[PDB]
């Protein structure tokens, strides 16, 4: 689960070489279907993703 009520079971363990790699070499470790947003309207997860990426990038800690 996330901190926004988006609970779900673990359905697969996707091999690390079959995951979509980014142009920076990275590779996600969680894949989250984008269809839980439209009906549940948890816009706080889409802001937490950006806040946490900015934190990990700048060494900061946002509130």
């Amino acid at each position: 689960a996330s901190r926004h009520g988006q609970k779900g079971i673990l359905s697969r363990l996707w091999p690390a070489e079959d995951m979509p790699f980014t142009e920076s070499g990275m590779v996600p470790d969680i894949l989250f279907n984008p269809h839980g947003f439209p009906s549940r309207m948890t816009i706080g997860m889409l802001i937490e993703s950006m806040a946490g990426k900015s934190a990990a990038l700048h060494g900061l800690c946002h509130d």
């Binding site: 142009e23 920076s24 070499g25 990038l57 700048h58 060494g59 900061l60 946002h62 509130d63």
Partner: peptide, 15 residues
């Protein structure tokens, strides 16, 4: 309000 740290700078580059 929460706000920008001055300058910051990129902490990542391409290969």
């Amino acid at each position: 309000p929460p706000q920008i740290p001055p300058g910051l700078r990129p902490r990542f580059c391409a290969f």
